Design a protein around this ligand. Structure first.
Ligand SMILES: [Mg+2]
Ligand SMILES: [Mg+2]
Ligand SMILES: [Mg+2]
Ligand SMILES: [Mg+2]
Ligand SMILES: [Mg+2]
Ligand SMILES: [Mg+2]
Ligand SMILES: [Mg+2]
Ligand SMILES: [Mg+2]
Ligand SMILES: [Mg+2]
Ligand SMILES: [Mg+2]
Ligand SMILES: [Mg+2]
Ligand SMILES: [Mg+2]
Ligand SMILES: [Mg+2]
Ligand SMILES: [Mg+2]
Ligand SMILES: [Mg+2]
Ligand SMILES: [Mg+2]
Ligand SMILES: [Mg+2]
Ligand SMILES: [Mg+2]
Ligand SMILES: [Mg+2]
Ligand SMILES: [Mg+2]
Ligand SMILES: [Mg+2]
Ligand SMILES: [Mg+2]
Ligand SMILES: [Mg+2]
Ligand SMILES: [Mg+2]
Ligand SMILES: [Mg+2]
Ligand SMILES: [Mg+2]
Ligand SMILES: [Mg+2]
Ligand SMILES: [Mg+2]
Ligand SMILES: [Mg+2]
Ligand SMILES: [Mg+2]
Ligand SMILES: [Mg+2]
Ligand SMILES: [Mg+2]
Ligand SMILES: [Mg+2]
Ligand SMILES: [Mg+2]
Ligand SMILES: [Mg+2]
Ligand SMILES: [Mg+2]
Ligand SMILES: [Mg+2]
Ligand SMILES: [Mg+2]
Ligand SMILES: [Mg+2]
Ligand SMILES: [Mg+2]
Ligand SMILES: [Mg+2]
Ligand SMILES: [Mg+2]
Ligand SMILES: [Mg+2]
Ligand SMILES: [Mg+2]
Ligand SMILES: [Mg+2]
Ligand SMILES: [Mg+2]
Ligand SMILES: [Mg+2]
Ligand SMILES: [Mg+2]
Ligand SMILES: [Zn+2]
Lengths: 60, 50, 114
RNA sequence: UGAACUAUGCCUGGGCAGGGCGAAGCCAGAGGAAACUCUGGUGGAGGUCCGUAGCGGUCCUGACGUGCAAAUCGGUCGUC
RNA sequence: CGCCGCAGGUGCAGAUCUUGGUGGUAGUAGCAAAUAUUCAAACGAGAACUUUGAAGGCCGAAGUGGAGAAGGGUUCCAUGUGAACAGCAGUUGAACAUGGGUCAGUCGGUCCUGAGAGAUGGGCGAGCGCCGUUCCGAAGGGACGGGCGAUGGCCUCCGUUGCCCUCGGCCGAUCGAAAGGGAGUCGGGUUCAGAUCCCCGAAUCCGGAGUGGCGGAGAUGGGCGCCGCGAGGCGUCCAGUGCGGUAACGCGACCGAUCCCGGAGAAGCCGGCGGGAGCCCCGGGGAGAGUUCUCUUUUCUUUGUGAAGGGCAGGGCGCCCUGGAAUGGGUUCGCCCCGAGAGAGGGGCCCGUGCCUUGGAAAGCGUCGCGGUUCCGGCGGCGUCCGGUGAGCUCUCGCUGGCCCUUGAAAAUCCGGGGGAGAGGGUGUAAAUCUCGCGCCGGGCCGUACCCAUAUCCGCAGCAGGUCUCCAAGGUGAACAGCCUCUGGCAUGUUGGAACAAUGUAGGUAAGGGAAGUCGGCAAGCCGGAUCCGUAACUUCGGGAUAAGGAUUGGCUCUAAGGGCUGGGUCGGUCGCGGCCGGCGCCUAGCAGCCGACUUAGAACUGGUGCGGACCAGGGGAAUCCGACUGUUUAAUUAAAACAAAGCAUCGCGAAGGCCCGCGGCGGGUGUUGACGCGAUGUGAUUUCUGCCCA
RNA sequence: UGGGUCGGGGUUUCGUACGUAGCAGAGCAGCUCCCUCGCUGCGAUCUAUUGAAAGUCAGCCCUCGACACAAGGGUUUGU
RNA sequence: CGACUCUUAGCGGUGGAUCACUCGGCUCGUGCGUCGAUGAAGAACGCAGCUAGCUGCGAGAAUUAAUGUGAAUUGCAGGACACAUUGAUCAUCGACACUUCGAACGCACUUGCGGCCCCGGGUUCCUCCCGGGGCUACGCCUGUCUGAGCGUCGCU
């Protein structure tokens, strides 16, 4: 789960996550929060584990 | 309503964000003179402009 | 009895908000939003009030994904005109063309006199 | 500057229990010398009747009248 | 600050004076609309109000229930607090504080047009501008087709590319619907709060695929010469843009442009029938509960199969073939249908939301247990069954009618046909092509929490007001009535306790009299349902009419009538205690058995004459005035006799026009009109009359 | 000694309780080795038990039966 | 005796007059006398470690660079900063940057949808998908190119 720029679309979010985390993603769901921030649920590919990716990111 | 435009939702977002109390450390600043947020808005008391 | 709710935000009994009851494998009754009733083609004759046979009755945009055989009949004008009025037009075309030959013969034989 | 209330026209939607009366059309039977009439069914019309919801707002000149309300409430009512 | 001068926005008790503050009133009015609370316990300093449990009640499915639209905008959800607020209180809160929460190709917006709005051209206008929306425009910037070439390159050959020929009127930009039109997503699980969006599993629509992803179709047969015993091979030539059925039409594809025709989108209200489902009801079989003082094989709960395919019922057909009908027949609740082809027989098509099947039991649910991952989509057992009924209710589909001086959208978008410009191969290794099967990739943006109201909206408020919808159980009953109940919900509507004075407000009863009361029967009361009788004057013959008036009505026990299903055989003369044809027989005044609704009528018995026992639920008659009726009206004192109305009558007008708008344009409305029309008046249905006067 | 609370009795109100029983009961449905005129259910209502049952001071009357409680509390007042 | 009421005084409340203060106004005068398609005024939304308002700023967002200055900022924290292989802060401001609406400019808006040309990626060039960049308003002047006319002519 990420907070993203409100102008970015699902394709841009997908490519941005793939580049700066070196992971493959399956799909991106997106909502805009009541406080105005865009939130993206980025499902990872089956061969990528979201647990240890969040560990190397530092948000575990 | 549930159905809203993006402009309306963004307007409501800013109104929500500024509807919070002042930080307590403001009251310790030099020459403060501010006691509390006088622009607090309750949803039932005062209705928004839109 | 178990009462029902709409499953969409359209809350009015309009022509696009028509439902039917359905029992799920979970043993609960729910709405299923039906599609509208399609119509078979009317005949191009404009006379016969019945609709064409051999053509599937679906909404117009469903015809895009149907195959060719489901939309016509193997005959001249098939799927666009009734068999009765196709027979009538075959006879009417032939007999009128015969009548033209009649008047052509009749005028050609009558012009022999100077 | 206003038709967010109201007035009127248009567009596109939604809605209106249960009963009574019994129009045309139709069937059969009967009477009659005929002409034709009578009887029983059927049928289900109508700015039709009783009466819900809805819409209205008659009377109590009821309640209230620093009110629940800057026009509301109860019964009784009009139409349905 | 004094004194000498100077200069004023220079003196307050008033002005229903202005602003601010404060009294008496006064601990007063008041905290009284919608039946209602009680016991115990917990937390806590503190409990009439919080929470849990137990009772007693209410909403009573047209809800005080479950969900939405508009509007609100975080009120949603957890945790904490006890200042202020919630007109008593509070341990509670829609308060305060801190955190969290709204996940989509297939739910909407988005797209289309509607009533309409609105640029450009043009016109007008001092001017900002506004008129106009096809009108006074050189208004098509597109196209597979063909040609000239640049060969840009996997320069084979097909893509690109500039120009030329040919074709090309939505003939008008653009905006306009979260209820109209509009492809395609369902089932299970999951949260403190989100799910048709997350997860699991099943689908599906649209788009793309250039070098072409795989199959299948096209499409692969005949004739002649030869070899070969035959089978089968070789050479040459000729076909081949599929096939079947009398037909309706069918089959898996089934070449084809510009162009033309058509369909679907795409059509009102009401009635009566019929089919399907959901619900309700009835008889059993299970599982779990309740009662058991006595009785009750009892009472209650529960007892699944999505989309998308395939198959089969069922419904419909104004579809086809045979044939030719009066002694007319068929047939509906009603109708209606037939030599323009009935009845009968045999077919074809459409819908198929029903059943079976894949999905599918592996899930879900109900029970009974066994372990744990402080809070396992844990593990396991068993079950998820058989039937019957209907003027039943609600959706839905269909058929057939009625009504209209009313005839009940448009456009996106999709499809079929007509035609045959073209394209494709020389018999193959087949070609052009393919709406057939399978395979590959993608579907961006915005909304999505919650309330939806006797507390989340508007009314200054948690205001008896207002505010658009969907679902809808049992009993009684004509019933979506009223009354009681189940599912679900609630705590009596911004306080409690004790009393039971007057006067109120709301509701009852009252001897005898019966409107004597009062402006006036105001208010209240009487009547009331249904069945059987019985109904006048008058009348526009329709009505009046539930006229008036009268009798009956309970409970219990029977009786009678009102239907649906099957089967009606004279026999081994023989063998597939049963089957093929037949010598072998007379229900033909119809029986035999089984099954199932309500309704009507009659009778007996019976109760202290009570019985539409609550609820529901017309007082009636004789006249007079006015308005014909139905309708409408002064939101907030007038609902009427007022307005309207159909009917009658009159007037203007043939478009260079009548009536009217406009500051202006040869602008605009009636007018998408044309005297049976439009415009302007008066009177006010019917009937009958409508006299005299043009000074 | 007292007044209470129950109980009892009286009064009075209504009108004859539940259960049981009956060859009471319009009738109906089953059993016939039975029965030789019977037995097994359903059945409003009737009869007897039964002027019964129930209420009755809370502002009725009398108890001397039972039970407990009652020589307690607070605030004031002087010629 | 008290209570109550009245008057006066002390003290205490309620209230915010008076007086004193003044980083505000009002008035007069002076000098300049400067906006915008190179996108103004105005509006919206964002930006701080803790930040709601005001103020400042624009995704480089309570500010970057440069210059002057010369040890702070400060409410708390954190961390720089030999102040000479240059420097906190403030001021100035000439470099750079400057989101979305808005004359507002591709079309349109209470929504959203195009077209053209390059670049990159999935492609592994051919045109489909994703991203990036540059264009795409009206009027008008000069010139340019392409055109029209049974307008006036010329040659054939
Ligand atoms: Mg979304
Ligand atoms: Mg409000
Ligand atoms: Mg309006
Ligand atoms: Mg009527
Ligand atoms: Mg009526
Ligand atoms: Mg009054
Ligand atoms: Mg003065
Ligand atoms: Mg004064
Ligand atoms: Mg009081
Ligand atoms: Mg009170
Ligand atoms: Mg009730
Ligand atoms: Mg509700
Ligand atoms: Mg809450
Ligand atoms: Mg309070
Ligand atoms: Mg709050
Ligand atoms: Mg054109
Ligand atoms: Mg539009
Ligand atoms: Mg719609
Ligand atoms: Mg929810
Ligand atoms: Mg199944
Ligand atoms: Mg099913
Ligand atoms: Mg026939
Ligand atoms: Mg199972
Ligand atoms: Mg929701
Ligand atoms: Mg209210
Ligand atoms: Mg207001
Ligand atoms: Mg309330
Ligand atoms: Mg009450
Ligand atoms: Mg209460
Ligand atoms: Mg009396
Ligand atoms: Mg009397
Ligand atoms: Mg009198
Ligand atoms: Mg008198
Ligand atoms: Mg009255
Ligand atoms: Mg009368
Ligand atoms: Mg009787
Ligand atoms: Mg009238
Ligand atoms: Mg009249
Ligand atoms: Mg009115
Ligand atoms: Mg009025
Ligand atoms: Mg009135
Ligand atoms: Mg008249
Ligand atoms: Mg008239
Ligand atoms: Mg006694
Ligand atoms: Mg003082
Ligand atoms: Mg600097
Ligand atoms: Mg739109
Ligand atoms: Mg010329
Ligand atoms: Zn035809």
């Amino acid at each position: 789960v990420f907070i993203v720029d409100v102008k970015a679309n699902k394709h841009q979010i997908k490519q941005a996550v793939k580049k700066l985390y070196d992971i493959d993603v399956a799909k991106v769901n997106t909502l805009i929060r009541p406080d105005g921030e865009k939130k993206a649920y980025v499902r990872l590919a089956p061969d990528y584990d979201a647990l240890d990716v969040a560990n190397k990111i530092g948000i575990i | 309503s549930s159905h809203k435009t993006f402009r309306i939702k963004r307007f409501l977002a800013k109104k929500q964000k500024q509807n919070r109390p002042i930080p307590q450390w403001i009251r310790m600043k030099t020459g403060n003179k501010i006691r509390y947020n006088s622009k607090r808005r309750h949803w039932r008391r005062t209705k928004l402009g839109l | 009895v178990q009462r029902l709710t709409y499953r969409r935000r359209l809350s009015y009994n309009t022509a696009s908000n028509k439902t039917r009851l359905s029992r799920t494998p979970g043993n609960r009754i729910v709405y299923l939003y039906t599609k509208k009733v399609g119509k078979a083609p009317k005949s191009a004759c404009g006379v016969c009030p019945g609709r064409l046979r051999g053509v599937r009755a679906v909404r117009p945009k469903v015809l895009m994904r149907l195959s060719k055989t489901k939309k016509h009949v193997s005959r001249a004008y098939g799927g666009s005109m009734c068999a009765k009025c196709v027979r009538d037009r075959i006879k009417r075309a032939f007999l009128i063309e015969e009548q033209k030959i009649v008047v052509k013969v009749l005028k050609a034989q009558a012009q022999s006199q100077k």
